[PDB]
A paper describes a structure:
The protein translocon at the endoplasmic reticulum comprises the Sec61 translocation channel and numerous accessory factors that collectively facilitate the biogenesis of secretory and membrane proteins. The central component of this translocon is the Sec61 complex, a heterotrimer containing a channel-forming α subunit and peripheral β and γ subunits. Sec61α is a pseudosymmetric channel that can open axially across the membrane and is laterally gated towards the lipid bilayer. Three factors are linked to co-translational Sec61-mediated secretion: TRAM, TRAP, and RAMP4 (also called SERP1, known as Ysy6 in yeast). Both TRAP and RAMP4 are tightly associated near-stoichiometrically with ER-localised ribosome-Sec61 complexes from pancreas, an exceptionally secretory tissue.
The occupancy of the hetero-tetrameric TRAP complex (comprised of α, β, γ, and δ subunits) in the all-particle map was low, so we performed focused classification on this region and obtained two well-resolved TRAP classes. (B) Image classification separated two slightly shifted TRAP conformations, shown in their respective densities in the left and middle panels. The superposition of the two models shows that this shift in TRAP correlates with a shift in the C-half of Sec61’s lateral gate (helix 6). One additional protein density was observed in TRAP class 1, consisting of a TMD and cytoplasmic helix bound to TRAPγ. We provisionally assign this density to Calnexin because it is by far the major TRAP-binding protein and it is known to bind TRAP via its TMD. Anchoring of Calnexin at this position would explain how its elongated lumenal domain interacts co-translationally with nascent chains as they are translocated by RTCs. The TMDs of TRAPβγδ and the provisionally assigned Calnexin all bundle together, but not the TMD of TRAPα. Instead, the TRAPα TMD binds the lumenal hinge loop of Sec61α, as does the TRAPα lumenal domain.
Residue numbers in the entry:
A (entry chain L): 2 to 159
B (entry chain Y): 1 to 134
C (entry chain C): 55 to 319
The structure:
RNA sequence: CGCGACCUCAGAUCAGACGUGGCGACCCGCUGAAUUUAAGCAUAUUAGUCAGCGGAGGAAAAGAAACUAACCAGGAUUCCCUCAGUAACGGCGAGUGAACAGGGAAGAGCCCAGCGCCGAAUCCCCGCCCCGCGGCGGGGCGCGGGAAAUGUGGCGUACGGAAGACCCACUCCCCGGCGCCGGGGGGCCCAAGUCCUUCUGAUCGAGGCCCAGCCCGUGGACGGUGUGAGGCCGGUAGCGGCCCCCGGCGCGCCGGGCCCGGGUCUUCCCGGAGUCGGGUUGCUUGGGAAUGCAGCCCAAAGCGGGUGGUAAACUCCAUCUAAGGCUAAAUACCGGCACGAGACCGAUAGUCAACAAGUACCGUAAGGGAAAGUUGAAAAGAACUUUGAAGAGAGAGUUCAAGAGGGCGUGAAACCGUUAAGAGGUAAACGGGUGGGGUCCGCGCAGUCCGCCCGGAGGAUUCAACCCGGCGGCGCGGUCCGGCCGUGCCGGCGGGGCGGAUCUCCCGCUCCCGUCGGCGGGGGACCGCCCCCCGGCCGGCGACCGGCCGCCGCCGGGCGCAUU
RNA sequence: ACGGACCAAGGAGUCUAACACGUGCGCGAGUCGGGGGCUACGAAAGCCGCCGUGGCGCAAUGAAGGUGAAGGCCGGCGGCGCGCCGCCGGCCGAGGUGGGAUCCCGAGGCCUUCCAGUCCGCCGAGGGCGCACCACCGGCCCGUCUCGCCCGCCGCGCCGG
RNA sequence: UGGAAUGCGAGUGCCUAGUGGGCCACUUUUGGUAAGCAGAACUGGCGCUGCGGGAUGAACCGAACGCCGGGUUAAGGCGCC
RNA sequence: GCCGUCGCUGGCAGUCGGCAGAGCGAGAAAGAGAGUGGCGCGGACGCUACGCCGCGACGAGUAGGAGGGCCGCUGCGGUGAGCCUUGAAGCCUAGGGCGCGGGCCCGGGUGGAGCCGCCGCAGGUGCAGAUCUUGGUGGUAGUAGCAAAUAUUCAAACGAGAACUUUGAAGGCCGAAGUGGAGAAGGGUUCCAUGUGAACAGCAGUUGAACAUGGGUCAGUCGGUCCUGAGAGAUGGGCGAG
RNA sequence: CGACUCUUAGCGGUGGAUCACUCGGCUCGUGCGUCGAUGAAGAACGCAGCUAGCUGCGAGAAUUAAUGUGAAUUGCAGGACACAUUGAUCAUCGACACUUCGAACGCACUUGCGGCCCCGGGUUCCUCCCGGGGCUACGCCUGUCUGAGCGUCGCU
């Protein structure tokens, strides 16, 4: 029964909510497990970056966020085509590919095209057969300096 | 302090594993120290008590300098029976008293092929740790 | 258990059978038949308001307050009166705070650690921890809490090069990394004034860790020392000062007890 | 009539395989209430929930847009935070109630049919030969059998693809065997007191163990042992030691398969139908002129179709490409195997179950379902004598204790026997007030203690004052020297860090002709703050001191030898 | 009138969510890392800052389209006829009345042998600045109504102010 | 000359439990033959409240209560209890 | 007189000492003011300021509210150089005391291994009731009762023991629709021998269907086994989310 | 007097509270994440020198083999020409073994009836009797064999 001035409340506890309570007492143990799988993965792919493939820049939708850019899913075929990277070869050398994404304007297209070219300039590529270098592979001098990268690749900033 | 995640210091878990220990484990539990002479000679501190060892009782009512032979290792009861460590019942017969192995000192070891093999391994491990500190 | 007391088919006999109306166990042929069930007044029933795993066990404490609590602990740790009043035997330590050279960060053997505490006169505090070792009264003994003792000195280091292992076997000693200080360790029981020992490197990072008043903290993104509400806590100097003593009226210290009324007639 | 092909369909204890049932905490597909709330109740809520049925796996399901949007756009699925108790639904009452965007966990993409072209280039089974053979495989040979043109394999799938031409560039990628080289399971081990006195039934207790401080300590977790134990035992610590097995990652040989790619032109090809969509019905949803699903009827198209959250027509836009398929991870886990812990319970508690417990026992059955831990350190568990038919006793003996005697630790209350004391016809009990008697207590029974003073007897590490040494307090030392030092102020060619939505020769990429501009990346100047260095004023040293001098006080040592 | 023969042990306002107000602490026009991540007790604690996305607060108002929180004075010009409106440049400036803790000034006044006149204090009629808060009157923003005259322009409008 | 007497420090704001069966007496009073009946007004009580008196008693009369000593009273009493 | 509450939002930092000078309770504003000229070495207590001190008034209480508990219970962080086999918890006590009280301390006894004070934290935290739960025990009470179906007696034996067992002799009953001799269903070892006389057999027992130790059920022909009855129930098929 | 009754106390009973203990619960977290026609889960019945239950096991039955271990198991007894490379005991567990029912499978559920093949003993090759061993369930896929059709055809 209401009693003097008070908010009218409608708690949603008319079901069997106690049968479906999700406690979080495993949260620290989940955090350890997730971290331990990040470390074993970083060791597994080294010297490849721990973060993962390089992501593109994209503008957030809607008028509430379009002033901001962030990391998108993957570079588009137009972007890769203009940057002279084969779409099937892109994933092998750390580049993400997004066949769905469309380039509507040039400036956004160019920004990702340049981002690719900068990334290709920082790529240190180990030969397929270590004793038998090939055309595109990095020189043996710059392979001695190849160290794994921490954090997102070429972080995106506003 | 204990740091091994897979070793329990829980009181009840440790007692259940003591009182339900299988025979070949109760043997290891039923170990005795060696006399100062044996300790120096073999470079070993403790041995699993065995039948035909000769021991001194160093605690309790039957403590003294009398060296006696071990006549029975009653593992189920966690006690050993010793020569002359005994008493009489009501009807006058004699009965052994059970001394815990940890409350005696081994003064002579019943040696055979396997006892020597056991003795050497304990000293080899000890000497390794000695050269780790050095 | 959410089932405790509820794993039966008990049912109330209803009124008319000359017994309380508590639900009763069914069937026959055993003692349990016809006994009370469920209710919290019954033997073998369900407790009142059974405890739940989603009790709110954990509490949030504002970072600004937690840092405040670490500054209060450190400030208190440098006053002999408070460290004495925490039970520590620091009657012969050369100085407070006690800062030792950074060499002690590289010790390896427990004997190097024990010997240092004897030369710093922190060994009477260790011996008090040994003397306070005893058994715990109550069920804690059944629950892996059989032994109790009092906390000893706290050793704060900048980087561990065997100091943790060189000290960890001395009863009562607690190691702390200066960049990860803990209020639960610096104020055991909620009381400020634990006796601490600093290495030089640890003592030199405090200003960076918490900032001075003139310079904000360097190792915390945005933090500075809490401001003082009262700059001069010497209440006796304030009161006895000439300035205040000119403004006061003369004290009225004469006592006028009750006068027994005598009849003038 | 007969023989023979195919088609459709039968029978085999035909050769070789496969499914069944269980568990079910988590998962998927169905079916599905009513208690209950609405202060009645019928919609609603309960609730897509209980109960019922089916099917799995270590996860399942989902999943690479017939999506979201309307932005300068995003870009598979799943999970978390928020959106949000919000848009919405609702006898618009009670109540119910998502999504997009944003930030994170994780991150992975792909394959057919069709359209085509390749002499079916494809597959299964049988027998023989070589390797391997406890995951039955690889290679060679068979005018050996069969499936398959009612369509197998290669290329290829909406991100387009194919073929021909010109350029450009290509040698490692895997399969079956064979040999060599650097996480997991199991076993065995690795420090130090049983030192000297001592309490005890027994002790792990207490005291001690030279200057230094018994000894080890990367081991002072825990358990056992006749208390209470770092050092007696097991263990504990240790990038400790040794020994076996499994695995993984690398390096070589034999026999195999593949004869592989990119750019630009030219010509070609390109899609899932009783499905979509529409009507109606029932359920369902927040989804409201109908979110999803299903029955019945109608029933497509190909610049088509779907969506664009209010029905409909006309019209532009935007956005995907349905009616076929596979796919790890992040996520779930009250069952299982194996572990670790706890501000939890402590035998009427905690599981029903600490124990021969889902047992005894009840019910025809579906089902229902307890009670019940503790001698002692050690059985040393009471020989022997005696009364009795015996149960039971009296002695005796063990034990520290039977004042622990086999349902025995302690041993409460109710209730009972007996001993002692007191009392007794208005049931007993009770409050206030005294009195008498008891049990004990004062461990009473010639009664306190202290300061100063007077006087008698004595007796001494003998007083004051002086000297030497040490220590301390204070000093406006009217203004002593030296110091650190101001969350003080001034002067700095002072040597630097932090921050700035204050300004500004070098470089990476790009538009334009070798030139000229924009983005992004760097100096430098400037300002605010801070730290460090030097000079000047005042300034603290009471959260922060040394040396001299002075005064005072205290102590140690001399001397004072006695009207003190 | 109902429960209560007696004794032991057990036995009943708890925990989760939401809200309101009060109190305490921290910071403060901000504040909060709770989700994520980094680096025996410890599943703790510490850090993030281009992890503050986000929540709440900093803006209201309307069904909504939407709009969205002080003025006056001086000089010149323009229109009407000293005043009014439109337009231009310089000055001041977040209202006022009543009460109002505290604070401020100070007529006069606080003695010693007696006169003068000083330094520090202290009481004080009267007069001031007036905190919070309240009452009242103005003003400003959004919805609606009534009246009425103007100003703008890339779109001269069923436009906008 | 704070413009009658008397007495007294006032104002104000949040949060808030229990209650929401009452009953009785003087006086007034409706229905009823009346009722220890039903229903009203005012005040005071009982409820929630002991205490002296009415022998006894929810309400009558006196008087309201911390634990005490002395004194004196109220309403009521003083043959004996 | 004493206890508490309330009020005075009362007083005390002035313990200002030989670097000294003791006061500010008093009817009636504001300075125990500052100046310039005309021998001994001594002096109680206080002040956990959340403390201490003074003065005045008052004190009913259900429902209900609030405050303080150096009231009590269990566990956690600190602390008590805490207590304890020279004796912990628990329990008993015509022992001595403290507090308004919730309660607590000490003495004695029993007991045999652990416990407590203070500062904080936490709660499954305080019982006279609920025809409360479980367990134990009373009075009733040596009481109701051991009364349906005619009935016992004598002698001996064993035996510690005999109304009840056994043998003998009497007297009786069931009276072939039996209190007789056999089976089906059900029981499941109750059957038989020997032993015990603890528990059970509502008195007893030398006895028993009890207990204990050992035995015992023999088939071509007696039944089952086979047949089909009322019926139950696969496959084919049908339905069915299953 | 004294019975009887009441109160208090000592001692003794009845009773099993309290206290101390805890090889049990409960809650959280972690790793793995594994049944079955090659017969699972479950059930029945057996197995020990003395053994009822619990426990373990399956006619090889409180276990065999093997490996590790290294002198017991133990309530009593005993010692196989048991016990130190002629290995007690325990642990491990990869070899072997695993009665009846049970999805449960020759048909049925009474230890009831078969059938097919092989083998061994009866007698004396066949029969016949006895005993043992192996097969004999439903659905379903690939292939095989044998067939059916006034199904569609071709040649006769
Ligand atoms: Mg209410
Ligand atoms: Mg050792
Ligand atoms: Mg329970
Ligand atoms: Mg206790
Ligand atoms: Mg076959
Ligand atoms: Mg209702
Ligand atoms: Mg209701
Ligand atoms: Mg109803
Ligand atoms: Mg629903
Ligand atoms: Mg269900
Ligand atoms: Mg099922
Ligand atoms: Mg299944
Ligand atoms: Mg599985
Ligand atoms: Mg799947
Ligand atoms: Mg997605
Ligand atoms: Mg919100
Ligand atoms: Mg309505
Ligand atoms: Mg719903
Ligand atoms: Mg989203
Ligand atoms: Mg990420
Ligand atoms: Mg094709
Ligand atoms: Mg696609
Ligand atoms: Mg011990
Ligand atoms: Mg000692
Ligand atoms: Mg120990
Ligand atoms: Mg020691
Ligand atoms: Mg060791
Ligand atoms: Mg180890
Ligand atoms: Mg498709
Ligand atoms: Mg429905
Ligand atoms: Mg619905
Ligand atoms: Mg529309
Ligand atoms: Mg799938
Ligand atoms: Mg029990
Ligand atoms: Mg029980
Ligand atoms: Mg229980
Ligand atoms: Mg009990
Ligand atoms: Mg208890
Ligand atoms: Mg007990
Ligand atoms: Mg005793
Ligand atoms: Mg005893
Ligand atoms: Mg005991
Ligand atoms: Mg007992
Ligand atoms: Mg007893
Ligand atoms: Mg008595
Ligand atoms: Mg008497
Ligand atoms: Mg009633
Ligand atoms: Mg009754
Ligand atoms: Mg109780
Ligand atoms: Mg409220
Ligand atoms: Mg608040
Ligand atoms: Mg932990
Ligand atoms: Mg009512
Ligand atoms: Mg009336
Ligand atoms: Mg009435
Ligand atoms: Mg009432
Ligand atoms: Mg009242
Ligand atoms: Mg009254
Ligand atoms: Mg009368
Ligand atoms: Mg009086
Ligand atoms: Mg009278
Ligand atoms: Mg009161
Ligand atoms: Mg008593
Ligand atoms: Mg004991
Ligand atoms: Mg509790
Ligand atoms: Mg009770
Ligand atoms: Mg009778
Ligand atoms: Mg017969
Ligand atoms: Mg008969
Ligand atoms: Mg009888
Ligand atoms: Mg018989
Ligand atoms: Mg015959
Ligand atoms: Mg038949
Ligand atoms: Mg049927
Ligand atoms: Mg058996
Ligand atoms: Mg074997
Ligand atoms: Mg062996
Ligand atoms: Mg039959």
């Amino acid at each position: 029964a209401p009693s003097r001035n008070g908010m009218i409340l409608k708690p949603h506890f008319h079901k069997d909510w106690q049968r479906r309570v999700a406690t979080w007492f495993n949260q620290p143990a989940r955090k350890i497990r997730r971290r331990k799988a990040r470390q074993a993965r970083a060791r597994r792919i080294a010297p490849r970056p721990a973060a993962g493939p390089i992501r593109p820049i994209v503008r957030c939708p809607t008028v509430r966020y379009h002033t901001k850019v962030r990391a998108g899913r993957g570079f588009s075929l137009e972007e890769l085509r203009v940057a002279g990277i084969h779409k099937k070869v892109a994933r092998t050398i750390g580049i993400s590919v997004d066949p769905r994404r469309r380039n509507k304007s040039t400036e956004s297209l160019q920004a990702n095209v340049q981002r690719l070219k900068e990334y290709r300039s920082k790529l240190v590529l180990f030969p397929r057969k270590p004793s038998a270098p090939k055309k595109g592979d990095s020189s043996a001098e710059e392979l001695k300096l190849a160290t794994q990268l921490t954090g997102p690749v070429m972080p995106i900033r506003n | 302090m204990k740091f091994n995640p897979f070793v329990t210091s829980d009181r009840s878990k440790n007692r259940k594993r003591h009182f339900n220990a299988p025979s070949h484990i109760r043997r290891k539990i039923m170990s005795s120290p060696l006399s100062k002479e044996l300790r120096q000679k073999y470079n070993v501190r403790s041995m699993p008590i065995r039948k035909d060892d000769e021991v001194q009782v160093v605690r309790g009512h039957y403590k003294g300098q009398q060296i006696g032979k071990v006549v029975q290792v009653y593992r189920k009861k966690y006690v050993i029976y010793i020569e002359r460590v005994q008493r009489e019942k009501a009807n006058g017969t004699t009965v052994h008293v059970g001394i815990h192995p940890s409350k005696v000192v081994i003064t002579r070891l019943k040696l055979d092929k396997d006892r020597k093999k056991i003795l050497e391994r304990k000293a080899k491990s000890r000497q390794v740790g000695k050269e780790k500190g050095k | 258990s959410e089932l405790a007391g509820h794993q039966t088919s008990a049912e109330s006999w209803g009124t008319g059978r000359a017994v309380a109306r508590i639900p009763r166990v069914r069937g026959g042929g055993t003692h349990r038949s016809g006994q009370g069930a469920f209710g919290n007044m019954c033997r073998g029933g369900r407790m009142f308001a059974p405890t739940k795993t989603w009790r709110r066990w954990h509490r949030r404490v504002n970072t600004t307050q937690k840092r405040y609590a670490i500054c209060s602990a450190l400030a208190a740790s440098a006053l002999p009166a408070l460290v004495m009043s925490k039970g520590h035997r620091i009657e012969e330590v050369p100085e407070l705070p006690l800062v030792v050279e950074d060499k002690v960060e590289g010790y390896k053997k427990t004997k190097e650690a024990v010997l240092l505490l004897k030369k710093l006169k922190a060994w009477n505090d260790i011996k008090k921890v040994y003397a306070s070792q005893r058994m715990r009264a109550g069920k804690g003994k059944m629950r892996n809490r059989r032994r109790i003792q009092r906390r000893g000195p706290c050793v704060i280091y900048n980087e561990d090069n065997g100091i943790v292992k060189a000290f960890r076997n001395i009863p009562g000693i607690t190691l702390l990394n200066v960049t990860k200080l803990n209020i639960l360790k610096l104020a055991p029981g909620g009381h400020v004034g634990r006796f601490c020992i600093w290495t030089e490197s640890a003592f030199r990072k405090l200003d960076d860790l918490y900032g001075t008043w003139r310079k904000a903290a360097s190792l915390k993104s945005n933090y500075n020392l809490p401001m003082h509400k009262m700059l001069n806590t010497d209440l006796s100097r304030i009161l006895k000062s000439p300035e205040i003593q000119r403004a006061l009226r003369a004290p009225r210290k004469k006592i006028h007890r009750r006068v027994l009324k005598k009849n003038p007639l």
